[PDB]
Ligand binder design. Structure first.
Ligand SMILES: [Mg+2]
Ligand SMILES: [Mg+2]
Ligand SMILES: [Mg+2]
Ligand SMILES: [Mg+2]
Lengths: 52, 106, 65, 252, 88
RNA sequence: GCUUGAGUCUCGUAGAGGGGGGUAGAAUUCCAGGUGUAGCGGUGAAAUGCGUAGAGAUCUGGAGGAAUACCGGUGGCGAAGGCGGCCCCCUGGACGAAGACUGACGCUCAGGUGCGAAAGCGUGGGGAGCAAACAGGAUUAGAUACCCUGGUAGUCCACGCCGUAAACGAUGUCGACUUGGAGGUUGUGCCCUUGAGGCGUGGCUUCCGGAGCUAACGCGUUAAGUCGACCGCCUGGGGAGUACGGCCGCAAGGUUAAAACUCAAAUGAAUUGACGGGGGCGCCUUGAAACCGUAGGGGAACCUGCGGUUGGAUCACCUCCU
């Protein structure tokens, strides 16, 4: 078991767990209206690619 | 009347009184003129996380059709009886008689 | 899709830990239905089942507990 | 930041000030020459503070003004107006115009010198002036207007359109004058009791005073003072506020 | 929201036969029995406004049916409101 | 009289619909130790702050209040406001199935009545985390902001009140009709060779788009098309949803609601240059918040808290007849 291969295995596990992205975004409260707006904005920003 | 699942777990170090518990509760069911379609134990079984700082606690299932009243009696008997560490009661759609997958694995 | 639809058509399930394990992360989180290929009807049933299975310590909540 | 631009209202302000000898006059914030000149003119000699040392050089080097004033170059909130009142032989007339973040501090520093000041004469923004003179039963009323009306009688002088200022703001503003009472019409045992009573009350202005000043006094105290505890904080005159202050101080 | 058997008792009382359901008498009776029962619900569940929206629909539905029957036949109306004690 | 509208019944179905009561695993803070020791904490950097009385860290044990990671979706339920850990208890509505039954029982609705986010109020609890106000440290020409360390109300609960929100699909309610197309979701029938499939067939719902409509934008069988019944509302811009009166409210305020007076506009959509700061490669072309309700601060226009909405930005000079 090479230390730096166990490190790569660990890095894949924390990436698959997403935990840094979660604790990053969880840093503040939000007025629920803005994540509602951001959600539908992303939904149309996606749907525009579906067209060809 | 309402079919139910009743499913509960007992402290590993009180697992020996479990037959007495099956007596107490089955007597409540038949003493309510209710009926039973499964009774099962899955022995001492390991816990995904500690319950009351314990491990390996003893698991039990019943399939039942008793009137609602006595379900609240045996339910509150679980909060009286500290040998039962958890219970869940489910108002299931039907009486069901085919053994638990926990038994059928044997 | 239709093979995953058959998994729903065959069965509606709780206490089958062996099948529940097909739909969890190793960290104990529920898999999103699009990755399972299963239809939303069965996803709800699976989620409800997993929540019960966690309550009775049949499945962990997390990796640690 | 702002200073005035139009001679009509400059002349109106400096004339309404009535600045003449037989008065212990001192400017603060001389700013643009145009509005400091007529007051330094009409007073045979005048004292001034400018906060800025560069503007203090511009005006002290101006031969209209440097020979005709005595000039100081510091934050006025450091300045010992009680000694300047002694050096000027009688309590001061303090007056002018400023960037006015400092306004809230100015009033407290002026009130630290209610003995040493004969009167204050200053431009200010419309909302804070209308608050400062507000009658007890109004939304414009509140803790700072209470303390102001406690320390002094307060009097709007005249009101000025925004195009009148050198950088014209969006905001209309008025010159106001005020007078430290020769004897306090509201005698008080202490002002810190007023300040904390008023802040507690106005920090809670939407609820009943039973749920504001009655968090400290009892309802039987309040009604014993003749005050209905079911009122809101903005029903209450400075008179009964100083009565509460005396009650707090003397029953402590 | 009623047991089939309480429904059976009511329709076998107020109905023409077992083939009748939804004669005005059957309707207003079972509707009344439901309204009577739900007094016990709301006597605990004061804040259950979303449930009481259904109750308001039911009492007004009762009123509409009664008034139709009243103009259709006063005898059926009077003996029915007599049997149910309606206009209480 | 009738059964087509309306509506009852029998059997199923899906669902964060509501009300009530238990309960769980994360988490934060806090307390109690234990091990341990010079730092921690914070920012752009600082400072205030915390620690040699041992903090920070990390282990254990306990407390308490709050919220439900993931599923979770262009997804369901709900009149709307809104509704999301799990189980129970009570309870509302809806949709499909197949009959059976009543027999026009219908729709709309001025007054009226009731429900009604967020904020705030009333009475008595609770108070973890967060946080108007406030307090203190910073930043800045100034800074009231933006930054940080604190922090009350509030946020939570029961029981009253208020009754407003960009409470907006900015789109009244009900009914009929009128090309298509790709999905989603949830029943159901028949065929299934089964298991997948494949023919159907309701309900709900999303995005395209024909006709037609529309100032244009766009809407488009879930109309903004074609029409029938009733209700609500508007009549230039400001003054002004302001005055006054009445009503209502504990108070905030709500509500109904002027006029004088003043202006030749005010306004909606869309076109072309600026844009410009560019951005890419002379050429194509954009790294360039407003508000709503409500409560409070208050050098400003403003700053702050709560929660909703998206309507997220510019500005415009030298003549003419067939
Ligand atoms: Mg309260
Ligand atoms: Mg609230
Ligand atoms: Mg009004
Ligand atoms: Mg809303």
């Amino acid at each position: 078991e090479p230390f730096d291969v166990a490190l790569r295995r660990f890095k894949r596990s924390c990436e698959k767990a997403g935990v840094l992205a979660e604790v990053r975004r969880r840093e503040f409260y939000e007025k629920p209206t803005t994540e509602r707006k951001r959600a539908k904005a992303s939904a149309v920003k996606r749907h525009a690619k579906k067209l060809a | 009347m309402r079919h139910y699942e009743i499913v509960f777990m007992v402290h590993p170090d009180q697992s020996e009184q479990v037959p007495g518990m099956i007596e107490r509760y089955t007597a409540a069911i038949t003493g309510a003129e209710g009926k039973i379609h499964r009774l099962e134990d899955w022995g001492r079984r390991q816990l995904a996380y500690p319950i009351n700082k314990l491990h390996k606690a003893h698991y039990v299932l019943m399939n039942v059709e008793a009137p609602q009243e006595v379900i609240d009696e045996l339910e509150t008997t679980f909060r009286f009886n500290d040998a039962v560490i958890r219970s869940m009661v489910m108002r299931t759609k039907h009486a069901v008689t085919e053994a638990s997958p926990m038994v059928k694995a044997k | 899709f239709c093979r995953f639809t058959a998994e729903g058509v065959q069965e509606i399930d709780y206490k089958d830990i062996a099948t529940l394990k097909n739909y969890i992360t190793e960290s104990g989180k529920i898999v999103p239905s699009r990755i399972t290929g299963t239809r939303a009807k069965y996803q709800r049933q699976l989620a409800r089942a997993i929540k019960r299975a966690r309550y009775l310590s049949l499945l962990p909540y997390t990796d640690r507990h | 930041q702002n200073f005035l631009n139009d001679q009509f209202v400059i002349d109106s302000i400096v004339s309404a000030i009535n600045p003449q000898k037989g008065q212990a006059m001192v400017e603060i914030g001389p700013g643009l020459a145009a509005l400091t000149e007529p007051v330094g003119e009409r007073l045979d000699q005048l004292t001034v503070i400018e906060l800025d040392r560069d503007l203090a050089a511009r005006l002290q080097t101006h031969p209209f003004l440097g020979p005709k004033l005595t000039i100081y170059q510091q934050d006025a909130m450091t300045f010992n107006f009680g000694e300047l009142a002694e050096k000027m032989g009688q309590p001061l007339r303090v007056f002018g115009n400023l960037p006015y973040n400092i306004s809230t501090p100015l009033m407290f520093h002026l009130f630290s010198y209610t003995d040493a000041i004969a009167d204050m004469h200053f431009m200010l923004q419309k909302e804070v002036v209308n608050r400062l003179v507000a009658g007890p039963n109004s939304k414009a009323y509140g803790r700072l207007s209470v303390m102001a009306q406690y320390y002094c009688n307060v009097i709007p002088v005249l009101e000025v359109p925004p195009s009148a200022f050198t950088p014209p703001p969006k905001v209309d503003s008025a010159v106001v004058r005020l007078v430290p009472h020769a004897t306090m019409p509201h005698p008080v045992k202490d002002v810190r009791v007023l300040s904390r009573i008023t802040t507690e009350a106005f920090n809670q202005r939407r609820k009943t005073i039973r749920n504001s000043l009655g968090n400290l006094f009892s309802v039987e105290v309040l009604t014993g003072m003749g005050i209905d505890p079911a009122m809101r904080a903005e029903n209450i005159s400075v008179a009964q506020y100083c009565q509460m202050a005396n009650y707090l101080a003397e029953n402590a | 929201s009623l047991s089939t058997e309480a429904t059976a008792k009511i329709v076998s009382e107020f109905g023409r036969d077992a083939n009748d359901t939804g004669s005005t008498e059957v309707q207003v009776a079972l509707l009344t029995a439901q309204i009577n029962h739900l007094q016990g619900h709301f006597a605990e569940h004061k804040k259950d406004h979303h449930s009481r929206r259904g109750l308001l629909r039911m009492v007004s539905q009762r009123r509409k049916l009664l008034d139709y029957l009243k103009r259709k036949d006063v005898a059926r109306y009077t003996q029915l409101i007599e049997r149910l004690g309606l206009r209480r």
